[PDB]
Design a protein around this ligand. Structure first.
Ligand SMILES: C=CC1=C(C)/C(=C\c2[nH]c(/C=C3N=C(/C=C4\NC(=O)C(C)=C4C=C)C(C)=C\3CCC(=O)O)c(CCC(=O)O)c2C)NC1=O
Ligand SMILES: *[C@@H]1O[C@H](CO)[C@@H](O[C@@H]2O[C@H](CO)[C@@H](O[C@@H]3O[C@H](CO)[C@@H](O)[C@H](O)[C@@H]3O)[C@H](O)[C@H]2NC(C)=O)[C@H](O)[C@H]1NC(C)=O
Ligand SMILES: *[C@@H]1O[C@H](CO)[C@@H](O[C@@H]2O[C@H](CO)[C@@H](O)[C@H](O)[C@H]2NC(C)=O)[C@H](O)[C@H]1NC(C)=O
Ligand SMILES: *[C@@H]1O[C@H](CO)[C@@H](O)[C@H](O)[C@H]1NC(C)=O
Ligand SMILES: *[C@@H]1O[C@H](CO)[C@@H](O)[C@H](O)[C@H]1NC(C)=O
Ligand SMILES: *[C@@H]1O[C@H](CO)[C@@H](O)[C@H](O)[C@H]1NC(C)=O
Lengths: 49, 49, 244
């Protein structure tokens, strides 16, 4: 979990569109959809092979 | 860097320094000058033997 | 912090040796992995090695013999304990273990877990004292000065003994790197009088910024807590091994 963060303004969740995203400093480009995955309590993202 | 305060080689972070002539021009500030061997990173020695 | 206590009934430690099976593995990093097979170098306790055993109980001749020597802490330590009445409360880490150098204490007051770093005057026998079944006094050191670190985590544990069989096995791994003390922990409840063979992996618990030279430790046996004004001990066992 993030404990110290910089002064940025948040926007609205836009779903099912090719967008640029910034989650807690993790940046990228793609399409965001709902998930049926499960995380551990102090985990923030998941990576594949 | 050998007897008082040592940073690790893989340091990540920032360093700030500034002059304080008008508030700290007094007696009572010491540094260690003799010691057998060097200290390891992020270690303290408060002995006065 | 109350101070002083003296034990003449003592006897020489036996220093038994036991097999280590396949115990003493831990999570060595903070990277989440899924369905992957990796090769890792590091410091671990080898499989099948010998490790050392000490005990504590009143045998019969109006006398109690404990076992708290001073052990080396080279590259890291694996610790194990078999107990049934909340016996082994804490450790002492340092270099000379006297009032000329800083020392670190990790203990339990049956109400909190306490971690402090200062110029301690250690006693000849560190232990707590309960009033039959009431946390009475604590005699671990008499004076502490010029003191750097202090922290406590609330953890209330039961102080009513249930002697007989062994009901708990607790395992720990201690590491030191870059001013940080790393404590990994694992716990289970079993009903047996040896250490079962198996393969157990220990989870991270604490990462403490102490900034102190550590080369030696000893065990605090605060067992003496079950009497009135006379104070003697129940039984317990513990095991020590190293890392390579
Ligand atoms: C100093 C305290 C100490 C403890 C409690 C510890 C960690 C620890 N001991 C646990 C179980 C336990 N095992 C013990 C026994 C201990 N009490 C002791 O003084 C020692 C050395 C242990 C070792 C584990 C206790 C008190 C519990 C029960 C905790 C509870 O009530 O949840 C648990 C699981 C339950 C919980 O999260 O509270 C942790 C994390 N390591 C330690 O060194
Ligand atoms: C531990 O704590 C004690 C008390 O705070 C520290 O004692 C103090 O030590 C300094 C020197 O480091 C003393 O200063 C010296 O005092 C004498 C006269 O007493 C003077 O002649 C010297 O020129 C110098 O000023 C200070 O007096 C002393 N104070 C007390 C109350 O003892 C001690 O240094 C600490 N030890 C450490 C470094 O952990
Ligand atoms: C130390 O413990 C290990 C683990 O139990 C023992 O290894 C077993 O040894 C038997 C007999 O050779 C084998 O059949 C098992 O397959 C082994 N298991 C494992 C996991 O190694 C080892 O023999 C013990 N050594 C001593 C001297 O007691
Ligand atoms: C383990 O203990 C046995 C018996 O004392 C000894 O022969 C052996 O060298 C020791 N080392 C091992 C294999 O762990
Ligand atoms: C330190 O311990 C020694 C030996 O017990 C004692 O003589 C001395 O007075 C103690 N000094 C302090 C710092 O209390
Ligand atoms: C234990 O807790 C009691 C009651 O809060 C307190 O008086 C005492 O100082 C504590 N002792 C230790 C060793 O922490």
């Amino acid at each position: 979990p993030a404990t110290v963060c910089g002064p940025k303004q948040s926007t609205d969740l836009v779903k099912n569109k090719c967008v640029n995203f910034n989650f807690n400093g993790l940046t990228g480009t793609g399409v965001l959809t709902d998930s049926n995955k499960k995380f551990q309590p102090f985990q923030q993202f998941g990576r594949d092979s | 860097a050998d007897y008082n305060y040592k940073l690790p080689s893989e340091f990540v972070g920032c360093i700030l320094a500034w002059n304080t002539r008008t508030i700290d021009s007094k007696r009572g500030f010491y540094y260690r000058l003799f010691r057998h061997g060097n200290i390891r990173p992020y270690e303290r020695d408060t002995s006065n033997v | 912090q109350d101070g002083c206590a003296t034990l003449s009934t003592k006897l020489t430690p036996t220093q038994l040796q036991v097999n280590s099976t396949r115990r003493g593995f831990y999570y060595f990093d903070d990277i989440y992995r899924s369905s992957l097979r990796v090769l890792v170098p590091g410091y671990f306790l080898p499989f099948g090695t010998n490790i050392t055993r000490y005990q504590a109980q009143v045998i019969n001749w109006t006398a109690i013999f404990f076992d708290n020597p001073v052990i080396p802490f080279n590259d890291g330590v694996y610790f194990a304990a078999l107990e049934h009445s909340n016996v082994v409360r804490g450790w002492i880490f340092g270099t000379t273990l006297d009032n000329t150098t800083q020392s670190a204490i990790v203990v339990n007051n049956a109400t909190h877990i306490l971690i402090s770093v200062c110029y301690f005057n250690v006693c000849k026998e560190p232990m707590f004292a309960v009033s039959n079944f009431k946390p009475y006094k604590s005699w671990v050191y008499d004076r502490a000065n010029n003191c750097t670190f202090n922290r406590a985590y609330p953890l209330n544990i039961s102080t009513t003994p249930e002697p007989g069989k062994f009901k708990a096995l607790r395992e720990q791994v201690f590491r030191y790197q870059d001013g940080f003390l790393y404590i990994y922990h694992s716990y289970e409840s079993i009903n047996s009088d040896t250490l079962p063979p198996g393969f157990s992996v220990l989870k991270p618990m604490l990462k403490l910024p102490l900034g102190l030279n550590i080369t030696r430790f000893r065990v605090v046996m605060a067992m003496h807590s079950l009497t009135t004004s006379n104070f003697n001990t129940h039984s317990v066992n513990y095991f020590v091994g190293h890392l390579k």
